[PDB]
Design a protein around this ligand. Structure first.
Ligand SMILES: O=C(Nc1ccnc(NC(=O)[C@H]2C[C@H]2F)c1)c1c(Cl)cccc1Cl
Length: 288
């Protein structure tokens, strides 16, 4: 599907993704105003060949994905400036859980329904042989009080049929506070590594995305802020010692133990996303 830049009317910027900025546009070819609202992700004009090859890969990944709990790909727009493609996706009206939750006190049952929906979208992604590599409350978009969607595939990679992991590189933009120890130490990203990040995302939802309770805040309190180039090493060490993010207030102990199971140091001891679906359906049922 192809969108024309001449019909895209910019409303406002939505935020910064991984390779570039996301903006809210009205695609109005009739010029009346009845045009559909679209979220357009664009690659920065000054970006090198390293980001350009990754951006094209992000587009191809989202184009091949079709799930009710994954952001709907709408099409691409020919960006004459920057000589690249603009990723046109659906506008998810309520936005990110990182932005929504601190302003809207959402009940425990709805938060568990969101976690269940995340696992549903993630089991699909894993069945398609892809790893997300950036599962966080910031990347989970809210369509309505009962529907959630995974939104940023900038770090998403395809795991080859024979392999069970993807070898990652030393990057400053890596979401380390959402990463399993094997990612930090051995630079390997398994399907089980996305389950660690889910556990962290579940923690964020149960804290209502309170920035003072956030994973970078809580981990840096244990590490310290004057550790030179050793923040990640110190993070790897505390996780190896069995230290974890604390139990959020009003979080049921059962739910916290499920979180701790998503955070097993041993990747094989962790549940798959397919294992978490009937578990979270039952837990949501208990609290509804
Ligand atoms: O693409 C993003 N957000 C996005 C996409 C589609 N619709 C929305 N909706 C809204 O932002 C709602 C609040 C009103 F603007 C957000 C996005 C951004 Cl930018 C930054 C990081 C991660 C993601 Cl997923």
């Amino acid at each position: 599907t192809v969108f024309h830049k001449r019909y895209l009317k910019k409303i406002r910027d939505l935020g910064e993704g991984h390779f570039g900025k996301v903006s809210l546009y009205c695609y109005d070819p009739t010029n009346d105003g009845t045009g559909e609202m679209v979220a357009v992700k664009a690659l920065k004009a000054d970006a090198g060949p390293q980001h350009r090859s990754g951006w094209k890969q992000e587009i191809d990944i989202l184009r091949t994905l079709y799930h009710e709990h994954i952001i709907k790909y709408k099409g691409c727009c020919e960006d004459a400036g920057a000589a690249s493609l603009q990723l046109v996706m659906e506008y998810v009206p309520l936005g990110s859980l990182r932005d929504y939750l601190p302003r809207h006190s959402i009940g425990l049952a709805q938060l568990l329904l969101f976690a269940q929906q995340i696992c549903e979208g993630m089991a699909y992604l894993h069945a398609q042989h892809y790893i997300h590599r950036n599962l966080a409350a910031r990347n989970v978009l809210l369509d309505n009080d009962r529907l959630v969607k995974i939104g940023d595939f900038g770090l998403a990679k395809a795991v080859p049929e024979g392999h069970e992991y993807y070898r990652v590189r030393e990057d400053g933009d890596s979401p380390v506070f959402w990463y399993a120890p094997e990612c930090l130490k051995e630079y390997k990203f398994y399907y089980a590594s996305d389950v660690w990040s889910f556990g962290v995302t579940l923690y964020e939802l149960l804290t209502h995305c309170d920035s003072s309770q956030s994973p970078p805040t809580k981990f840096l309190e244990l590490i310290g802020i004057a550790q030179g180039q050793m923040t990640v090493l110190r993070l790897t060490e505390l996780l190896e010692r069995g230290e974890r993010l604390p139990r959020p207030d009003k979080c049921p102990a059962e739910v916290y133990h499920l979180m701790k199971n998503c955070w097993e140091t041993e990747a094989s001891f962790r549940p798959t996303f397919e294992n978490l679906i009937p578990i979270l359906k039952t837990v949501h049922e208990k609290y509804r």
